[PDB]
Amino acid sequence: TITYTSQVANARLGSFSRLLLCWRGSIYKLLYGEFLIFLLCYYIIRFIYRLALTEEQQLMFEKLTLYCDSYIQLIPISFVLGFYVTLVVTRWWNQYENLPWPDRLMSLVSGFVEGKDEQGRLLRRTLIRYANLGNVLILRSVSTAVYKRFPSAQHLVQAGFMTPAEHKQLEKLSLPHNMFWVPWVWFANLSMKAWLGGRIRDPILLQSLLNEMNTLRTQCGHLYAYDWISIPLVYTQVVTVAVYSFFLTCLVGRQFLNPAKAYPGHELDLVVPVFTFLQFFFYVGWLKVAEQLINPFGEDDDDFETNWIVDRNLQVSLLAVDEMHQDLPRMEPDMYWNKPEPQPPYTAASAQFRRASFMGSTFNISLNKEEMEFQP
């Protein structure tokens, strides 16, 4: 993902203006090809009109150029694009929110499941690795960036996400459906067995682990649903038909006619129509926003770093459930042990950030003494 949050931290002189100089993930890279095709078509038509067309043919073309320009509607094209792009952006953010993070589950698994011995170490590692396996199984089906990393289930075995025994078990259970739901059932069975084995003292704790596990299951199901149930094809087709019909119309209607005839609005001849290219950039970039955001799991530049997400999740989970289990910093009295009102200091650069506490909007209301007395 292209992150520019640091650049737009402050609303300064042209803070968004500086963003026009970015290339990666920009509108520039998305539509240079379409812009070049538009230029080629426009200049080909212009040269044909200038040279090949005879006087009567030029007159007929002139009438068409006049007719096409009047039709050029775009309050409707803005309407359709705005409702669509809003839909696409909302779905894109929901897709990101439904990404499963094992941080709530890994904390619980680190805490509840007991045993410093090798058995407890193995139990905790496998319990968190089942969640990671479910996440990677859904991601390699939803994203083309993770599929290229794990083309087949043997690649998951080679990468350490799946042990060979789990691979054999998953093959034995094979059904004509996506198998991303198996690890959650494995986790439920293993945690139940752990509770029966004494590793989890009180069942309330087992219920807590399952709830943080089924929340991950729901998030993965939402990812699968967003992958499967795409934005309706008819709506995308309507939007692209509108945009491309607009610009095919502009190919003729925005043509600069012969100044000799002196048609209204064509008095001056310029070699390039700046506004049509500017309208092209604006409208086609608006379409490209939805085009890039419609599938955020691809391998574009503004698409999510799903590979990094997978790697992080595995690393932090295996660290928390194994080395951080019952290894805590020495508990010592704070700096503010006997200070009733902790006031951490401010750096010189951050001195101005000190503000008085907001006590509510009614703090500054002034009343007379007669106004403040109670009535019977």
Least Å from the CB of residue 307 to a copy of itself: 4
Whether 65 and 250 have beta carbons less than 8 Å apart is answered as no
- Stretch in the footprint of a copy of itself (CB under 8 A) among 39-47, 48-56, 74-82: 74-82
Least Å from the CB of residue 133 to a copy of itself: 11
- Angle made by CA atoms 86, 284, 278, in degrees to the nearest 5: 120
Whether 354 and 141 have beta carbons less than 8 Å apart is answered as no
Residues ≥6 apart with Cβ < 8 Å to 46: 255, 256
- Interaction of residue 361 with a copy of itself, rule CB under 8 A: yes
- Interaction of residue 363 with a copy of itself, rule CB under 8 A: yes
- Interaction of residue 250 with a copy of itself, rule CB under 8 A: no
Whether 244 and 63 have beta carbons less than 8 Å apart is answered as no
- Interaction of residue 198 with a copy of itself, rule CB under 8 A: no
- Interaction of residue 166 with a copy of itself, rule CB under 8 A: yes
The amino acid at residue 203 is: P
Residue 239 to residue 357: CA distance in whole angstroms:
50
- Interaction of residue 70 with a copy of itself, rule CB under 8 A: yes
Torsion of Cα atoms, 168 then 173 then 175 then 177, to 10°: -80
The amino acid at residue 112 is: F
Binding positions for a copy of itself, 324-353, rule CB under 8 A: 324-337, 340-351, 353
- Interaction of residue 69 with a copy of itself, rule CB under 8 A: no
Least Å from the CB of residue 40 to a copy of itself: 13
- Interaction of residue 97 with a copy of itself, rule CB under 8 A: yes
Nearest CB to a copy of itself, comparing residues 52 and 233: 233
- Interaction of residue 103 with a copy of itself, rule CB under 8 A: yes
Whether 131 and 187 have beta carbons less than 8 Å apart is answered as yes
DSSP letter string, 78-107: HHHHHHHHHHHHHHHHHHHHT---THHHHH
Q: Give the x/- contact pattern for a copy of itself in 107-126, rule: CB under 8 A.
A: xx-xxx---------xx-xx
- Stretch in the footprint of a copy of itself (CB under 8 A) among 38-46, 50-58, 365-373: 365-373
Residue 49 to residue 68: CA distance in whole angstroms:
15
The answer to the question of whether 94 is labelled as a binding residue is no
- Interaction of residue 35 with a copy of itself, rule CB under 8 A: no
The token duo for 312 is 């992080």
Residues ≥6 apart with Cβ < 8 Å to 15: 7, 8
- Interaction of residue 52 with a copy of itself, rule CB under 8 A: no
Binding positions for a copy of itself, 251-270, rule CB under 8 A: 265, 267-268
- Interaction of residue 16 with a copy of itself, rule CB under 8 A: yes
The token duo for 311 is 């790697």
Binding positions for a copy of itself, 292-331, rule CB under 8 A: 292-295, 297-300, 302, 304-305, 307-308, 310-312, 314-316, 318-320, 323-331
Numbered residues of the known binding site for Ca(2+) = 9, 292, 295, 300, 303
